[PDB]
Design an enzyme around this catalytic site. Structure first.
Site, short mmCIF file in Angstrom:
data_model
loop_
_atom_site.label_atom_id
_atom_site.label_comp_id
_atom_site.label_asym_id
_atom_site.label_seq_id
_atom_site.Cartn_x
_atom_site.Cartn_y
_atom_site.Cartn_z
CG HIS A 80 -1.99 -1.12 1.09
ND1 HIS A 80 -1.88 -2.29 1.82
CD2 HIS A 80 -3.11 -1.25 0.35
CE1 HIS A 80 -2.90 -3.09 1.52
NE2 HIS A 80 -3.65 -2.49 0.63
CG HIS A 84 -1.73 0.24 -4.32
ND1 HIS A 84 -2.37 -0.69 -5.11
CD2 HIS A 84 -2.68 0.75 -3.50
CE1 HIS A 84 -3.64 -0.76 -4.78
NE2 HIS A 84 -3.86 0.11 -3.82
CG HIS A 118 -6.94 4.33 -3.19
ND1 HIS A 118 -5.90 4.32 -4.08
CD2 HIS A 118 -7.02 3.09 -2.68
CE1 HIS A 118 -5.37 3.11 -4.12
NE2 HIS A 118 -6.04 2.34 -3.27
CG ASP A 119 -4.57 2.22 -0.14
OD1 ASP A 119 -5.47 2.10 0.71
OD2 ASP A 119 -4.35 1.36 -1.02
CG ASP A 229 -7.98 -0.80 -3.95
OD1 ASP A 229 -8.57 -1.08 -2.88
OD2 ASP A 229 -6.80 -0.45 -3.96
CD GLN A 281 -4.03 -14.19 -4.45
OE1 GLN A 281 -4.35 -13.78 -3.33
NE2 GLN A 281 -4.10 -13.45 -5.52
O1 MRW Z 1 -5.83 -12.18 -2.34
C1 MRW Z 1 -5.94 -10.89 -2.08
C2 MRW Z 1 -6.38 -10.50 -0.82
C3 MRW Z 1 -6.51 -9.14 -0.55
N1 MRW Z 1 -6.20 -8.21 -1.48
C4 MRW Z 1 -5.76 -8.57 -2.70
C5 MRW Z 1 -5.45 -7.57 -3.63
C6 MRW Z 1 -5.00 -7.94 -4.89
CL1 MRW Z 1 -4.61 -6.70 -6.05
C7 MRW Z 1 -4.85 -9.29 -5.22
C8 MRW Z 1 -5.16 -10.28 -4.30
C9 MRW Z 1 -5.62 -9.92 -3.03
NI NI Z 2 -5.58 0.38 -2.44
NI NI Z 3 -7.20 0.71 0.93
#
Ligand code: MRW
Ligand code: NI
Ligand code: NI
Length: 330
Positions: A80, A84, A118-119, A229, A281
Site C-alpha cells: 500500500h 500502488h 485512496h491509500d 484498487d 488467491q
Molecule cells: O488475495 C488478495 C487479498 C486481498 N487483497 C488482494 C489484492 C490484490 Cl490486487 C490481489 C489479491 C488480493
Molecule cells: Ni488500495
Molecule cells: Ni485501501
C-alpha cells in the site's frame, strides 16, 4: 506525525518533466504496467490528468506540489505504497478514456485524484487489525477505518499552502468534488464492495439501473473504484504474480504482530502457511475480483479487457494448484 511536504526541488523537477513519446500510446491501454518506469510515475500522473481533464484543469504549480506531497505521504511499506497509488490512478484513467462522456469533468478530475490519494498514510495494517487491537484510528472511525483516514489525509494535503488544486472551483463545485472524492475513497473498503456489487447486479439484471440517478451513479463509481484498487489482478501474469509477493509480504508482517499479541492470524496472514496461498488467491478471485469485473463489464462494456485479463489470471492460479507452474522470478 504531521502532514509531509514536498521540497521545491521535487515539485519544480516534476514541472520540467517530459514523457518519452513511445509511452503515450502504451498508457492508454488497460494492461499497461507502470513497473519498469519508476522515475516517471509522477509525470505519468500529470500526463493522465492533462489528457483526461485538460492542461488548464489545474494550475500546474499547485498540481505538481500536490502530487509530490501525495507521494511523500505514502509510507515505505511493501504494497500500500506510492507505486500502488499510481497503478490505481492509471486504471481509472483507462476506464475514463474508454467511457469519457459518461462522466462529468468534475467526476474525472475528482476520480483521478481520489485514486492517487485512496491509500494515503497506510501503515501496512488492515481494518481487522486496527479494530482488534483498538488503535486510536478505530476509535475515531468505527467503520471503514483506514479509508476514512485516507480521505482525512487527502483533505490535509489540499489544505497545505499552495496545494489546493480545487480552489478555482465554484463553491458549489468544490463541495461536490470533495464529496465525489470522499465517496470514492470510502468505496475502496472491500467490506462495502460485497453489497454494492450485489445491488448493481440486481439493478442491471432487472433493468432499473439509471446513470442519471445520483444514488446509482455513486454505486457505479464505487464499483469502478473496486476494479481500479484490485487491477494488479488484470495485468499480465508475471506482473500480477510479482505484485502478489508484495501483498503477502504485508499480510505476513501483520500476522507476525498478531502472534506477539497472543492471537493466531488467519491463514492468509500466516507466513508458515505459504502452501495455502494459491488456493486463497483462487478464493479471492472467485469471491471478489471475477464478480467485480463481470458486473463492471455489464455496466461499462469497454472495460471488458479488465475482466478478460482477470479470467486469464484465475486460470494461472489454477495451474499453480495443479502443480503446473513454470519458472518464476521475484
Ligand atoms: O488475495 C488478495 C487479498 C486481498 N487483497 C488482494 C489484492 C490484490 Cl490486487 C490481489 C489479491 C488480493
Ligand atoms: Ni488500495
Ligand atoms: Ni485501501
Amino acid at each position: 506525525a504531521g502532514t509531509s511536504i514536498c521540497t521545491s526541488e521535487e515539485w519544480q523537477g516534476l514541472m520540467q518533466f517530459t514523457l518519452p513519446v513511445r509511452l503515450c500510446k502504451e498508457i492508454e491501454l488497460f494492461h499497461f504496467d507502470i513497473g519498469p518506469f519508476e522515475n516517471m510515475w509522477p509525470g505519468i500522473f500529470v500526463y493522465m490528468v492533462h489528457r483526461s481533464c485538460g492542461t488548464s484543469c489545474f494550475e500546474l504549480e499547485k498540481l505538481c506540489r500536490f502530487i509530490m506531497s501525495v507521494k511523500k505521504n505514502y509510507r515505505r511499506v511493501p504494497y500500500h505504497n506510492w507505486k500502488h497509488a499510481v497503478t490505481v490512478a492509471h486504471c481509472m484513467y483507462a476506464i475514463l478514456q474508454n467511457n469519457h462522456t459518461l462522466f462529468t469533468d468534475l467526476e474525472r478530475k475528482g476520480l483521478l485524484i481520489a485514486c492517487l490519494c485512496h491509500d494515503l498514510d497506510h501503515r501496512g495494517f488492515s481494518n481487522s487489525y486496527l479494530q482488534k487491537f483498538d488503535h486510536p484510528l478505530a476509535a475515531l472511525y468505527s467503520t471503514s477505518t483506514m479509508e476514512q483516514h485516507h480521505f482525512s489525509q487527502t483533505v490535509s494535503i489540499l489544505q497545505l499552502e499552495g496545494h489546493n488544486i480545487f480552489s478555482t472551483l465554484s463553491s458549489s463545485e468544490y463541495e461536490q468534488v470533495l464529496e465525489i472524492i470522499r465517496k470514492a475513497i470510502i468505496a475502496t473498503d472491500l467490506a462495502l464492495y460485497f453489497g454494492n456489487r450485489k445491488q448493481l447486479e440486481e439493478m442491471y439484471q432487472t433493468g432499473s439501473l439509471n446513470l442519471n440517478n445520483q444514488s446509482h451513479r455513486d454505486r457505479v463509481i464505487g464499483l469502478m473504484m473496486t476494479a481500479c484498487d484490485l487491477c494488479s489482478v488484470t495485468k499480465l501474469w508475471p506482473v500480477t504474480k510479482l505484485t502478489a509477493n508484495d501483498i503477502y509480504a504485508e499480510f505476513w508482517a501483520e500476522g507476525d504482530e498478531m502472534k506477539k499479541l497472543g492471537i493466531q492470524p488467519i491463514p492468509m496472514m500466516d507466513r508458515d502457511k505459504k502452501d495455502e496461498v494459491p488456493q486463497g488467491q483462487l478464493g479471492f478471485y472467485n469471491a471478489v475480483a471475477i464478480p467485480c469485473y463481470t458486473t463492471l463489464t455489464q455496466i461499462l462494456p469497454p472495460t471488458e479487457p479488465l475482466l478478460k485479463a482477470c479470467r486469464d489470471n484465475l486460470s494461472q492460479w489454477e495451474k499453480v494448484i495443479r502443480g503446473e507452474e513454470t519458472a518464476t522470478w521475484i
